Amino acid sequence: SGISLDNSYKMDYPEMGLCIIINNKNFHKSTGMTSRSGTDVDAANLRETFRNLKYEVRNKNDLTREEIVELMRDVSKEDHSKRSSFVCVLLSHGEEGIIFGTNGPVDLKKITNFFRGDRCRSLTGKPKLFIIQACRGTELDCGIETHKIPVEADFLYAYSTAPGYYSWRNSKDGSWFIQSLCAMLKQYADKLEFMHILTRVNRKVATEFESFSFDATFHAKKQIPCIMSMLTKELYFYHH
């Protein structure tokens, strides 16, 4: 055949892959963690958005830390040979490096390690996308008026917020990041490469949202998401 280029992930396997959505709304009383009003809006929006991208969506609600680890282990042991990619969305409380089960924390590294290139061989060389709506600390942004491969290769972490910062969720509309991510995927997934979609998400979150609070400490605050890419190729949700 003619000249070939290898700059984009092969996304024309028989299946796009799994989209695992972990939606933690209600936490065990002993943890002292508040319920996450608005997260069901996020979970429904993600289910519909990824359905239209032809992902096999599995929604899970209110999982303990043990259930999260077991679920991720089990999913990583499925045969993904016929799948182009893998997506996991985590909606919960968090801190830097941590997402909360309903009864306590899970290290994000423990979750993602199951999918390392050496530990999930049917995903080696395929994009592994972790979308994380959770706090990464307690900082607030005041804003300003205007051949081997590495085992860590081929992961993308689409964080809702900058390292060290709270992440904002509206109890009626859903989280700022997930609202914006779904809108940009709906508008651009048939048009733009994934990093360019996520850059539009960054702009939407940064420009269109600002917190309103009766508490001066939490009022008029801003958010920038954080794209963390270890991908080695361009990612388009469509194929030719």
Partner: peptide, 4 residues
């Protein structure tokens, strides 16, 4: 608006 609430934080996570």
């Amino acid at each position: 608006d609430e934080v996570d």
